[PDB]
Amino acid sequence: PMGRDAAGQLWYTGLTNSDSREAWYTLPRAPDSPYREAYARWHGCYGHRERSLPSAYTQRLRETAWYDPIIPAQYTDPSTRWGSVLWKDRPIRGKEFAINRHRF
Amino acid sequence: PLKVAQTRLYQRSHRPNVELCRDAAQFRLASEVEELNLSLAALKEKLLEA
Amino acid sequence: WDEHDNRTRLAERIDTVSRWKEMLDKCLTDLDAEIDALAQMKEKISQAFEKLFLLQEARQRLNSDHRGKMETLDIDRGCLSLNLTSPNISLKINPTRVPNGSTSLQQWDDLSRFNKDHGEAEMKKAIELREAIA
Amino acid sequence: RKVGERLQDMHGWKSELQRQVEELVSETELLLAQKQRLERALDATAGPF
Amino acid sequence: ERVNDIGFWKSEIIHELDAMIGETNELTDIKKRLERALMETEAPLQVAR
Amino acid sequence: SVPESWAKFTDDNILRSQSERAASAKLRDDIQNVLVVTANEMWNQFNKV
Amino acid sequence: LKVAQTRLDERTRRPNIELCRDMAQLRLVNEVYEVDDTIQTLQQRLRDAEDTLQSLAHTKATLEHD
Amino acid sequence: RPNVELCRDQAQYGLTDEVHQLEATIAALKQKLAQAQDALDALYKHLARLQADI
Amino acid sequence: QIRLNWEHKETCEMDWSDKVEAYNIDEACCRYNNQSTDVQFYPHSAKFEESASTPETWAKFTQEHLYRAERERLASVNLRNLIDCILQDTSEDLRLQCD
Amino acid sequence: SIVTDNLQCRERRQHPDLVRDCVEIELLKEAELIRNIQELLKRTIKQAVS
Numbered sequence: 001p002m003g004r005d006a007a008g009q010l011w012y013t014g015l016t017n018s019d020s021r022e023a024w025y026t027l028p029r030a031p032d033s034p035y036r037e038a039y040a041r042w043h044g045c046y047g048h049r050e051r052s053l054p055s056a057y058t059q060r061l062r063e064t065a066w067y068d069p070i071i072p073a074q075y076t077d078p079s080t081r082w083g084s085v086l087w088k089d090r091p092i093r094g095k096e097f098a099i100n101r102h103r104f
Numbered sequence: 105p106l107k108v109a110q111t112r113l114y115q116r117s118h119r120p121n122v123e124l125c126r127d128a129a130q131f132r133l134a135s136e137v138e139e140l141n142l143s144l145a146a147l148k149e150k151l152l153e154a
Numbered sequence: 155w156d157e158h159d160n161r162t163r164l165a166e167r168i169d170t171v172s173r174w175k176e177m178l179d180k181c182l183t184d185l186d187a188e189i190d191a192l193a194q195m196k197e198k199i200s201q202a203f204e205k206l207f208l209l210q211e212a213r214q215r216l217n218s219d220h221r222g223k224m225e226t227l228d229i230d231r232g233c234l235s236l237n238l239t240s241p242n243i244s245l246k247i248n249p250t251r252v253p254n255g256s257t258s259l260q261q262w263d264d265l266s267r268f269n270k271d272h273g274e275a276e277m278k279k280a281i282e283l284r285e286a287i288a
Numbered sequence: 289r290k291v292g293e294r295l296q297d298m299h300g301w302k303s304e305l306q307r308q309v310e311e312l313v314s315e316t317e318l319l320l321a322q323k324q325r326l327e328r329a330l331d332a333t334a335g336p337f
Numbered sequence: 338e339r340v341n342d343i344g345f346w347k348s349e350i351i352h353e354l355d356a357m358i359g360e361t362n363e364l365t366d367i368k369k370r371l372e373r374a375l376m377e378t379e380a381p382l383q384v385a386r
Numbered sequence: 387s388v389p390e391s392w393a394k395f396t397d398d399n400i401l402r403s404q405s406e407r408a409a410s411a412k413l414r415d416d417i418q419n420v421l422v423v424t425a426n427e428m429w430n431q432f433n434k435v
Numbered sequence: 436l437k438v439a440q441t442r443l444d445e446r447t448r449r450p451n452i453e454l455c456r457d458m459a460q461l462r463l464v465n466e467v468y469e470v471d472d473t474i475q476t477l478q479q480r481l482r483d484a485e486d487t488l489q490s491l492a493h494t495k496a497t498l499e500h501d
Numbered sequence: 502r503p504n505v506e507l508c509r510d511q512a513q514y515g516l517t518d519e520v521h522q523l524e525a526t527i528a529a530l531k532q533k534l535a536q537a538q539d540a541l542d543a544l545y546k547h548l549a550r551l552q553a554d555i
Numbered sequence: 556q557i558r559l560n561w562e563h564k565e566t567c568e569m570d571w572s573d574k575v576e577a578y579n580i581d582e583a584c585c586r587y588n589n590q591s592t593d594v595q596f597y598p599h600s601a602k603f604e605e606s607a608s609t610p611e612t613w614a615k616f617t618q619e620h621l622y623r624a625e626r627e628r629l630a631s632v633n634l635r636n637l638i639d640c641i642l643q644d645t646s647e648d649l650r651l652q653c654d
Numbered sequence: 655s656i657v658t659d660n661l662q663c664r665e666r667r668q669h670p671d672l673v674r675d676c677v678e679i680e681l682l683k684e685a686e687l688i689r690n691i692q693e694l695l696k697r698t699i700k701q702a703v704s
Contacts, residue, residue: 001409011405013398038349039397042342046389049338049458057461061388065658069692071464079472082703091486093493099483105589106596112584113600122570122616123298123577125608129290137601152373156519163512207335214331219505226506239338242565244572247309250517254317255507262508295581297610301617302574308624309567315628316560320503322638323557329642333649339457342389346396351599353403358598360407367414374421378428385435387455395452538593 015039106144109137161234168230174266175223181273182220185213188277195287202287205280212273219269436470439463556631563627570620657684 001007012018014036020026029035050058054076060067070081087101113133117124189209196202236242387395443463502508587594608616661681 011401013394014401015397016394036397036401038400039393042345042393043390045342046393053458053461057458060461061456061458063388063658063662065655070696072468082699084703091490093490097487097490099480107594108587108589110597110600111594112587113604114597115580115584117600117604119577119580120573122608122613123573124605125610125613126606127290127294127610129294130604132290134601156522160512160515160519163510163515167510167512210335211331214334218327222503222506226502229502239341244565244569245575247306247568247571249520253507255504256509257505257507258509262505265505291581291585295578295585298574298578298581301614302571302578305567305571305574305617305621308621309564309571312560312564312567312624312628315631316557316564319557319560319631319635322635324504325642326638329645333645336649336653339459343453346393349400350396353400354599355597357403357407358602359596360410364410364414367417371417371421378424381428381432387452389455389457392453392455535593538595541595542592 015043106137106140109133109140113137164230164234168227168234171223171226171230175220175227178216178220178223178270181270182213182216184277185209185216185273188280189213192280192284195284198287202283205276205283208276209280212269212276215269216273219266436467436474439466439470443467556634560627560631563624567620567624570617657681657688661685 014034018034019036019040050061054073056067056073072081074081085102089097089099089101091097113130116127116129116133119125189206192202192206192209196206440463443460446459664677664681
């Protein structure tokens with residue numbers, strides 16, 4: 001309160017450090033338990049949507065910066081990053097011109 | 105009629121993005137809610153003096 | 155469950171119409187090879203010219219059918235691409251309506267097989283023309 | 289009564305957009321036949337070349 | 338899906354707001370009952386004196 | 387912020403509002419108890435006199 | 436490229452609590468980088484098509500004379 | 502789709518069956534919502550009398 | 556012109572598809588009474604509310620959409636007239652040179 | 655990675671010491687300087703490949 005009555009009270013949040021994940025052995029609920037239903041449902045649908053992205057895009061959604069600074073990943077990009085080779089065929093009358101010497 | 109006016113305001117609030125409007129019904133319902141609250145307060149004062 | 159089953163039926167129709175498109179692509183490039191070979195011994199001759207005319211108009215009819223298959227695959231792939239939470243979804247003015255060009259499955263694929271059979275017919279008749287002129 | 293008058297105006301504009309959508313359907317459906325005639329003319333001009 | 342999550346959070350907020358308004362006008366009612374009772378308790382003091 | 391941090395912030399607000407509703411409910415029940423005890427005490431002393 | 440990258444900037448006017456980074460930021464930056472890459476490869480292949488048609492025109496010039 | 506391609510496949514029967522199921526589904530859900538709000542009204546109507554007689 | 560017709564068609568179809576839900580909402584608000592049930596205490600709405608339009612601005616938005624729809628229909632008829640003249644010119648000019 | 659871990663660790667403090675002191679200013683300057691430097695390195699690697 002804001003009064004002459006005043007108390008410095010600490011309070012701990014619900015799904016942090018006080019609740020657990022669901023299972024059939026812990027099935028129905030205990031009414032005394034801080035089961036925060038809103039964060040539980042939201043984080044369930046968030047995890048369902050979260051599992052689709054690959055792992056570098058998961059660790060960009062973490063707190064500390066363990067991610068690779070360059071945005072395109074190694075295992076997804078078909079081209080080499082900062083590769084110097086590029087086959088340019090000079091047009092000369094006579095011999096045969098061709099394309100895509102990178103992937104033959 | 106407090107229940108009637110509040111439920112009408114709620115169902116009118118669940119409207120799509122362009123048909124949600126600053127309507128004549130909205131001003132009448134706001135005045136109705138205010139008038140019902142003041143009338144209820146006067147009725148409670150009469151009850152206490154009774 | 156009903157939405158998943160509708161996705162399965164739509165993908166089945168995609169897998170039918172893509173097969174028809176690729177096999178008509180095969181027939182189209184075989185007609186291109188045939189017109190070029192018949193030209194290369196054209197360079198009896200009146201019969202060669204008039205079956206060149208028949209072969210050209212058959213090629214144009216299968217070309218029209220091939221373009222129709224192209225746009226039909228584009229429409230069905232887009233219709234499966236669209237899903238929950240996109241802006242295009244709306245209540246329609248008349249969802250249930252049978253339009254003017256109503257035809258059935260049997261008549262549709264017998265028509266497509268019919269113009270393919272015509273194509274193979276003038277290919278074969280052209281082959282004994284090829285061997286008679288040679 | 290305020291609810292009633294807003295309902296009447298909304299009904300009128302809904303029916304008007306119904307008429308406009310139907311007319312645009314009919315206009316596009318009659319424009320497609322010119323493309324059919326165009327393609328037939330393209331065939332019968334591909335022959336004379 | 339992002340704007341759907343925002344809408345879910347809005348609905349949670351407005352639920353708690355409705356309950357909160359009910360609490361605060363109940364407590365104002367109890368406070369005015371306490372004031373009326375205080376004056377009624379004040380008068381027998383004058384009687385006893 | 388990250389979406390988990392954003393969602394935990396709004397649930398912390400909702401739990402604070404729920405806690406304050408709980409404190410007000412306990413306070414109003416104790417107001418009613420103070421009223422009934424006070425009335426009984428004054429009337430008992432009145433009747434002894 | 437128009438629609439995706441102005442979608443990004445028209446999103447990023449957000450206030451303090453909802454100034455965040457969801458999956459939409461990451462998917463949109465991947466979108467604009469890959470559309471940019473498609474632009475460069477189609478530009479290069481258009482350039483090589485122009486060179487091929489130059490060779491075709493040159494062979495026409497030397498063959499219609501002979 | 503154009504003139505030769507309106508094929509009337511299995512998809513049109515599937516879609517009309519889904520729509521035809523769906524108006525009945527939404528109608529039954531509105532009916533149950535009305536029933537539930539009627540029940541809440543009845544519980545208030547007796548809670549008032551209990552609260553007065555106490 | 557066919558695809559441009561389609562996209563203004565679905566845009567005006569959006570502006571019509573709002574109306575069915577809003578009309579059902581206002582009709583459901585019309586059928587309340589005092590003796591009827593299903594009215595309740597929802598006290599957020601009087602204190603706090605969001606606004607997006609006035610009736611004249613809503614009507615003006617509908618005029619803008621319907622105007623652009625009618626322009627896009629009429630431009631198609633203009634191009635159809637050009638198609639008529641061009642194909643008659645093509646048939647005449649090929650026949651005269653062939654003869 | 656080291657800088658962002660310092661940011662979250664120092665932000666997890668208790669109530670009578672959650673202070674925007676000079677340490678948090680220097681940590682923000684570190685985050686900005688690191689990201690500018692590594693993006694400049696990215697562009698320089700592109701030019702050296704070209």
